[PDB]
Design an enzyme around this catalytic site. Structure first.
Site, PDB file in Angstrom:
ATOM      1  N   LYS A  12      50.308 -50.750  -7.572  1.00 45.05           N
ATOM      2  CA  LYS A  12      51.080 -49.968  -8.530  1.00 45.05           C
ATOM      3  C   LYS A  12      52.012 -49.019  -7.787  1.00 45.05           C
ATOM      4  N   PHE A  71      45.952 -41.851 -24.773  1.00 44.43           N
ATOM      5  CA  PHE A  71      47.405 -41.894 -24.672  1.00 44.43           C
ATOM      6  C   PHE A  71      47.816 -42.315 -23.268  1.00 44.43           C
ATOM      7  N   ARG A 105      38.419 -47.328  -5.714  1.00 45.17           N
ATOM      8  CA  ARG A 105      38.776 -46.408  -6.785  1.00 45.17           C
ATOM      9  C   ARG A 105      38.398 -44.970  -6.454  1.00 45.17           C
ATOM     10  N   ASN A 160      47.476 -44.796 -11.854  1.00 43.95           N
ATOM     11  CA  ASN A 160      47.833 -45.850 -10.912  1.00 43.95           C
ATOM     12  C   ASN A 160      46.618 -46.215 -10.073  1.00 43.95           C
ATOM     13  N   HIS A 217      45.123 -53.268  -9.283  1.00 44.13           N
ATOM     14  CA  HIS A 217      44.677 -53.848 -10.545  1.00 44.13           C
ATOM     15  C   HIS A 217      43.461 -54.748 -10.358  1.00 44.13           C
TER      16      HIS A 217
END
Ligand SMILES: Nc1nc2c(ncn2[C@@H]2O[C@H](COP(=O)(O)OP(=O)(O)OP(=O)(O)O)[C@@H](O)[C@H]2O)c(=O)[nH]1
Ligand SMILES: Nc1nc2c(ncn2[C@@H]2O[C@H](COP(=O)(O)OP(=O)(O)O)[C@@H](O)[C@H]2O)c(=O)[nH]1
Ligand SMILES: Nc1nc2c(ncn2[C@@H]2O[C@H](COP(=O)(O)OP(=O)(O)O)[C@@H](O)[C@H]2O)c(=O)[nH]1
Lengths: 6, 48, 440, 427, 372, 426
Positions: free
Chosen positions: E96, E142, E190, E200, E203
């Site tokens: 990302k 959101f 992560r 970001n 993926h």
């Protein structure tokens, strides 16, 4: 296994 | 008496009840792998 | 493109001939019904099986074997068994009764009925196949079925085919033990009519294989699943340089020029070196220069004779497996410096080898272990000459007063061949004496 | 211009002569796929010697692949460089290679000799000037020493001026793997000393013993001897495709070498052979190779030098060296050995210095002897024939295939002319 | 024993026909062999060969045998299908906008996990292909920041093939939220890398079935894929890097760390090239000048390249002299700080192939992703 | 587009055509309930040759089925194929013919042809373009040789343009099943030569051979000797019904084969015959088919072909094939056994090629041939006749139903002069 066996 | 069946190898008293890890692997030694055909006759080169 | 054709005649040949096709199907991938496993595919390049197999249109591989005997007991032994799917059902020709030790039967009365039909199969396969190289008959000298009937099959190819060499194999009629009474009468009979129509005729003695099983193996009381599995190894390594590629490969047409010096000396021996079980080869080492010396042991020959009283004439040391061709000339000159192993003076070289890149294999369930190397030595010797001194001596003592002759004369036989054949095996002994007799 | 036409007959020379096409194609830089794969530019402008070109500018060889049985043409279509040959002039056969001279000539050789001459013609009549015939044969059987004679006796009627230099393995002094040998070999030396103009020799025994003494190998296979022969024949054909300072073609070697017409069998070699452990403890000069040229234990022949006063030693150097160092050290080895060179020739030696080293070593060379010690290889095989003939020991097959008894006397009588006409000039 | 067979496909140059063969490899002895399925006779006989590897035995990865280039197309066997294809599964990943300046350690973690990287290319997707990534996602939170990062920040799509690729990717990734992962405090991609939770990351697909949807969303069939993800020029468009074989050696992560060192940016990476024509098109300046040209096109024939546009950052050291002299041994004579002494693996055919004249970098980059 | 009108008579015929009309159901994918459930689309292309259309996609044949007794077409409806044959196409009588010719040719089979000819002339004008005719009927019985020869006579009187073909069931010469075979078979072949162009003679003594020594069945019925006869019927029209390399119709082998108006007595065959148990050891290729159909033990009439010379020999083929390999095989069987042909025609062999082999085969062929060793199929009947004419053995049956002896006397002057043309050329 007479005559005509197989 | 050899009659452990008609076709069998007569095994001794101690050899019969022991471990039997011998039927699997290969038997002979090797053919020894020498250096290659053209490595001694012709090498690589480098300018620097 | 390098095919060979096999026939099996009489019970002593068809039952070894059973054991020939266990081994052949296991060298390649063929499951015993004739279909490939098809979990594993093979590339389209190789053409290995064409020495002994002919694959059909779809997926089944079909051998070259004509299993003929005039009895039903041993063919229907196979035709109902676990190997029935392999052969052609029209190849399995049978008849009505055995020859029952009557050359007057297997060649004159009963053997002449199916002989116009059994040549029609040897004519059929060789019509389809083009590069034919020889014949692999499997018979025995003893009985009147395996020796009376194979001589009819021996002379009909010589009139029809001709120039192809004809490599039969047989069980020798023994010195010590036997299982008939008319066998000395019978083994002289196949010599007179085949010798002008044969270019190769091997032999094996069966009770030496009894005693190899006691020393090299540990088998006491060996059955005939065991002896016929040692015959299979030797034939599959004579016939291994035609279906596998190696360093030193010989076609079957050099096997008659280089191995038959004179036109009546073409009966050599055979031996196989590493017949070792698992409890000893796990302790031994087996290199190349020490399996070659074991081939000259009197305790390793497949025929009981005396190699120490036989001057070796033309050895041919066929090898297999993981071998390298320096080691043979290390081994061969080591053999030729030895004092006991006597050779023939007027033959200058007298040696031949063959190195191949395929290992020996073992049909599972047997005694044998995984040996990396295998030597299958075909010894053309002088040592078998004195084994003709016994069987002619075994012939004439009932022929002093003509025992069992009146059974032959019933089925259209005269006495006259028995006298004409005894000098024919007296003409055969005088040439094996002169070859060892040196030219000074 | 300058070219050599090639054939590959017999099993023994088919493996060696196709081991030739990698020691050539790596020096000159051709990929197996036929594209140029060279590093330097200098080795492309004499490619018309061994190679004919193909459309698109890819490169194919001049070779002919013929032997009696299709077993070994499935072995020389093999992994390294099989793709390059023309598939039309591949030749196979049907009948067995049963080592008989009538199977060499009279029975099987008759059907091919119409076809297997038209593979010489289709690669020679499209040319300008022919200079050499290179044929890789043996001297044992009716496979390689019945076809090696056949494919050169036919040609001499039509290509008579030019030079025909084959390369042949001679029988070993200990054990041969053929037993039928001198019916054919002595029947093939009747034409090879007549038709050919130079004809080489190679022992199998000496090829092993270089590998144990100097190379200190443990296990010499049959893949090693191919390299040791293929390098010698690819060094004596280099002043015909390289720049150099003292350059000789194959017909210089007609007038340099042979003084009397029937004495043309030479003794190969290759100088800077060594092991792996001893490289850092060896230095490379022109005097330090010159000993290893004239080493008694670096030849391909088992004959000792004491029987041999060398006629014409020709050591073809290849590298970046000095022309005086060559000339002073091809003479300083000669006064030191007076009795082992002939007194009726004043300069017994000959050099040739070139400009392109081999791939791998900065400098190498190629001994070529011509000795009076090669009567020992002559006394061997002529002596095997005399006992085997009076027995008529294996003559049943050749008479069965059609070779008369009165010709085997004649072949040994003319093989006796290769020592008798040799013995006049031995002394 | 235990050979593995494959179907091979080679383009014959003279008569331009596509040719199908059957190759065989023998693990444990190094042999290869090649028959022809089209015509049953054997052209190539059996040989031993040393450079081929069991990790090179993967469908698709194009390996040279005896100076011929071929892609392994099919499984001709059920045995090798069971032995390899049941285990070798593919997983999708994507760098990302935040991870471009921290990709070296993550790629080193991927190479330590042992996944084979097939295609790792920067991409700027079109409108429909961009919206198809966000079409599947729907929940309470959101995602405006993540949506603007996807539609604005450049990204890269990558495919990693491995044994249980989804399971190993999940076990390497760990927890989803950044604060939750840091509170769990295990060593994870992560936990150590990624910004602000869902803003970001790299993926990772949820399931093996959903990996197809994620891969089709990020990298679909090349209709509206988008050939460029970086600026064509920034007044210094003069540095080209390329990695043909050291990606197969595996040091791509370490060389990304050494180029992240000394404050040098990285702009755009991609992994598509034809072996000869594309390289020939831009080795044209190199055609007359360079020697050992055969070798310098052969080790680009060998493999795919993660080739990367890069700009000049500081004038104190030129990027060409950071790349080093043309020989690794000359680099080790002069200074260990040269990239050949750190990474260079061939005599002239260096680990990073660059451009020499500073003018042609813009044209080479515009060729390499603007045209291609 | 080129349909086939089929005729049947007797009970000898209607067991054969009941077996003929099921291999057509096999090859066109027709189930026994009238519909179509085949997986192809080329099988549905020329369906119209044997399958008229109706409502619901039903396909019902162009079949005529006739006898003088009700006792046989009860069983044809009661077979495995009852719903397909048309109920209006079972023309029936009440009294069996009983091995006599004038019971069907002059009195009881003669009053009933006006109901058969109503069926045909309605049906044959429903075809858009008929190719011709075919008949399988008994020369041995009283209905096929008696009534059916009128239908060969009277329909040819209507349209002389089309082609008459006959799957004749001629009697065996060795073992006979009726004591008036040298009358019903003698008198029937008096009218075949002015009227019929293709004549396929079939013997059961010739066919009891083939299902024993070649198919290896110890218990053969008629229904497994009917199928080989039903093989060669659909084995003739293989090229009209399907596309291929060289199509041929039933005028194309009535021109290549019969050089004269009266030399047209064929000799049938079928190529690929091997045992049921040993089916998968042979290689079904081009040399296997040709090596069988050029032999005497693959022949469907009981005369040895080696005693004469074939004038002309036809063939047909089926399945994907390499046409040069057949062309090598057809000259070899004209170059090797050149003494088994006459020397006064240049070419004697014809071939024709389909594309789709039958369901379960790959390579198929069918052998049709003129031969002048069919004299021994007719001289044995012609020498049986005069050994009982001279003793007047059964003439009271024949005179008492509307015949003469001058209709008897001229029926061997035809049969002698037929053989007195074949004799010269061999
Ligand atoms: N190698 C081997 N030899 C056997 C075997 N069985 C019997 N023999 C030998 O065969 C000899 C008899 O030879 P044959 O001619 O084959 O016997 P036969 O006449 O064929 O007997 P039938 O098959 O009934 O006709 C005996 O002396 C045995 O030594 C066996 O299983 N293997
Ligand atoms: N280089 C090499 N030489 C071999 C090979 N196989 C056999 N030879 C040589 O070929 C010889 C065989 O005798 P040869 O004259 O070829 O018999 P022929 O083929 O019948 O003519 C052996 O003595 C070996 O020295 C091989 O694979 N490579
Ligand atoms: N192979 C075979 N022969 C048949 C069949 N039906 C009848 N035949 C023969 O036909 C002859 C009898 O014909 P017949 O019933 O008198 O004729 P019809 O009275 O006109 O029906 C006998 O010789 C049978 O051998 C059949 O289905 N197959």
């Amino acid at each position: 296994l007479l005559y005509n066996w197989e | 008496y050899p009659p452990a069946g008609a076709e069998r190898v007569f095994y001794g008293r101690a050899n019969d009840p022991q471990i039997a890890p011998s039927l699997t692997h290969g038997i002979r030694s090797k053919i020894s792998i020498p250096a290659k055909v053209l490595i001694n006759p012709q090498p690589i080169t480098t300018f620097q | 493109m390098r095919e060979c054709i096999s026939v099996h005649v009489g019970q002593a040949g068809v039952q070894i001939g059973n054991a020939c096709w266990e081994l052949y199907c296991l060298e390649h991938g063929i499951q015993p019904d004739g279909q490939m496993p098809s979990d594993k595919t093979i590339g389209g390049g190789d053409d290995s099986f064409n020495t002994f197999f002919s694959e059909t249109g779809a997926g089944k591989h079909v051998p070259r074997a004509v299993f003929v005997d005039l009895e039903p007991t041993v063919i229907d032994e196979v035709r109902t068994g676990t190997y029935r799917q392999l052969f052609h059902p029209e190849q399995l020709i049978t008849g009505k009764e055995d020859a029952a030790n009557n050359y007057a039967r297997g060649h004159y009365t009963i053997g002449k009925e199916l002989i116009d039909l059994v040549l029609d199969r040897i004519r059929k396969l060789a019509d389809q196949c083009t590069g034919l190289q020889g014949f692999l008959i499997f018979h025995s000298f003893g009985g009147g079925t395996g020796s009376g009937f194979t001589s009819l099959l021996m002379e009909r190819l010589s009139v029809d085919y001709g120039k192809k060499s004809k490599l039969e194999f047989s069980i020798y009629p023994a010195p010590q033990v036997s299982t008939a009474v008319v066998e000395p009468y019978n083994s002289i009979l196949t010599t007179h009519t085949t010798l002008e129509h044969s270019d190769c005729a091997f032999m094996v003695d069966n009770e030496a294989i009894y005693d190899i099983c006691r020393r090299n193996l540990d088998i006491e009381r060996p059955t005939y699943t065991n002896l016929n599995r040692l015959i299979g190894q030797i034939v599959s390594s004579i016939t291994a340089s035609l279906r596998f590629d190696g360093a030193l490969n010989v076609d079957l047409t050099e096997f008659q020029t280089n191995l038959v010096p004179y036109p009546r000396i073409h009966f050599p021996l055979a031996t196989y070196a590493p017949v070792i079980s698992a409890e000893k080869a796990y302790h031994e080492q087996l290199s190349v220069a020490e399996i070659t010396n074991a081939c000259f042991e009197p305790a390793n020959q497949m025929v009981k004779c005396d190699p120490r009283h036989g001057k070796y004439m033309a050895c041919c040391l066929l090898y297999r497996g993981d071998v390298v061709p320096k080691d043979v000339n290390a081994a061969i000159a080591t053999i030729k410096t030895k004092r006991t192993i006597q050779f023939v003076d007027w033959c200058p070289t007298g040696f031949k080898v063959g190195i191949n890149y395929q290992p020996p294999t073992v049909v599972p369930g047997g005694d044998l272990a995984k040996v990396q190397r295998a030597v299958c030595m075909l010894s053309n010797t002088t040592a078998i000459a004195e084994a003709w001194a016994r069987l002619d001596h075994k012939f004439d003592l009932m022929y002093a007063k003509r025992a069992f002759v009146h059974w032959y004369v019933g089925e259209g036989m005269e006495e006259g061949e028995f006298s004409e054949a005894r000098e024919d095996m007296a003409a055969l002994e005088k040439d094996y004496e002169e070859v060892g007799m040196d030219s000074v | 211009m300058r070219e050599i036409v090639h054939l590959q007959a017999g099993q023994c020379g088919n493996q060696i002569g196709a081991k030739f096409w990698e020691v050539i194609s790596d020096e000159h830089g051709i990929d197996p796929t036929g594209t140029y794969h060279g590093d330097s530019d200098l080795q492309l402008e004499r490619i018309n010697v061994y190679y004919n070109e193909a459309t698109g500018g890819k490169y194919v060889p001049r070779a002919v692949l013929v032997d009696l049985e299709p077993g070994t043409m499935d072995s020389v279509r093999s992994g390294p460089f099989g793709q390059i040959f023309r598939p039309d002039n591949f030749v196979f056969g049907q009948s067995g290679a049963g080592n008989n001279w009538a199977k060499g000539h009279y029975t099987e050789g008759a059907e091919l000799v119409d076809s297997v001459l038209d593979v010489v013609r289709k690669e020679a009549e499209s040319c300008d000037c022919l200079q050499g015939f290179q044929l890789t044969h043996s001297l044992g059987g009716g496979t390689g020493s019945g076809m090696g004679t056949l494919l050169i006796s036919k040609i001499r009627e039509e290509y008579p001026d030019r030079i025909m230099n084959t390369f042949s393995v001679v029988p070993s002094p200990k054990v041969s793997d053929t037993v039928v040998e001198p019916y054919n070999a002595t029947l093939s030396v009747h034409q090879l000393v007549e038709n050919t103009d130079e004809t080489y020799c190679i022992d199998n025994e000496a090829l092993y013993d270089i590998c144990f003494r100097t190379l200190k190998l443990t296990t010499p296979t049959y893949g090693d001897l191919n390299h040791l022969v293929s390098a010698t024949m690819s060094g004596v054909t280099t002043c015909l495709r390289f720049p150099g300072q003292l350059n000789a073609d194959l017909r210089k070697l007609a007038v340099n070498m042979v003084p009397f017409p029937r004495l043309h069998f030479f003794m190969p070699g290759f100088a800077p052979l060594t092991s792996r452990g001893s490289q850092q403890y060896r230095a490379l000069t022109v005097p330090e190779l010159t000993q290893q040229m004239f080493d008694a234990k670096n030849m391909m022949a088992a004959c000792d030098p004491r029987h041999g006063r060398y006629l014409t030693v020709a050591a073809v150097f290849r590298g970046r060296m000095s022309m005086k160092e060559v000339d002073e050290q091809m003479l300083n080895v000669q006064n030191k050995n007076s009795s082992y060179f002939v007194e009726w020739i004043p300069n017994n030696v000959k050099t040739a210095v070139c400009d392109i080293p081999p791939r791998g070593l900065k400098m190498s060379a190629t001994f070529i002897g011509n000795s009076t010690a090669i009567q020992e290889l002559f006394k061997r095989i002529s002596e095997q024939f005399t006992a085997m003939f009076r027995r008529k020991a294996f003559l049943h097959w050749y008479t069965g295939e059609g070779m008369d008894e009165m010709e085997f006397t004649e072949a040994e009588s003319n093989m006796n002319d290769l020592v008798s006409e040799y013995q006049q000039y031995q002394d | 024993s235990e050979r593995f067979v494959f179907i091979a496909e080679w383009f014959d140059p003279n008569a331009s026909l596509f040719r199908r063969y059957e190759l065989l490899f023998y693990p444990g002895d190094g042999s290869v062999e090649m028959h022809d399925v089209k015509n049953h006779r054997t052209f190539l006989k059996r040989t031993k060969y040393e450079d081929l590897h069991l990790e090179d035995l993967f469908i698709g990865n194009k390996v040279n045998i005896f100076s011929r280039q071929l892609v392994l197309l099919d499984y001709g066997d059920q045995y090798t299908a069971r032995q390899l294809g049941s285990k070798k599964e593919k997983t999708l990943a994507l760098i990302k906008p935040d991870a471009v300046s921290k990709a070296g350690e993550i790629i080193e973690i991927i190479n330590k996990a042992g996944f084979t990287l097939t295609k790792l290319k920067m991409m700027t997707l079109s409108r429909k292909e961009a919206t198809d990534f966000h079409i599947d996602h729907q929940s309470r939170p959101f995602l405006n920041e993540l949506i603007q990062f996807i539609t604005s920040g450049p990204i890269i799509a990558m495919e990693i093939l491995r044994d249980d690729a989804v399971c190993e990717w999940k076990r390497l990734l760990g927890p989803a939220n950044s604060g939750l992962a840091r509170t769990d405090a295990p060593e994870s991609i992560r936990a150590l890398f990624g910004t602000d939770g869902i803003k970001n990351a790299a993926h990772g697909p949820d399931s093996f079935a959903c990996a197809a949807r994620e891969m089709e969303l990020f990298f679909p069939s090349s209709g509206v894929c988008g050939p460029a993800n970086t600026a064509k020029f920034t007044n210094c468009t003069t540095c080209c890097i390329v990695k043909p074989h050291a990606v197969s050696e595996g040091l791509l992560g370490k060389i990304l760390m050494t180029i992240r060192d000394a404050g040098f940016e990285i702009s755009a990476m991609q992994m598509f090239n034809m072996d000869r024509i594309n390289v020939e098109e831009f080795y044209e300046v190199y055609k007359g000048v360079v020697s050992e040209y055969n070798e310098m096109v052969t080790e680009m024939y060998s493999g795919p390249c993660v080739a990367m546009e890069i700009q000049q950052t500081n004038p104190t050291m030129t990027f060409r002299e950071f790349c080093g002299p043309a020989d690794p041994e000359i680099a080790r004579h002069l200074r260990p700080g040269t990239l050949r002494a750190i990474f260079g693996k061939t005599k002239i055919q260096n680990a990073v192939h660059c451009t020499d004249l500073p003018e042609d970098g813009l044209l080479e980059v515009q060729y390499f992703f603007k045209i291609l």
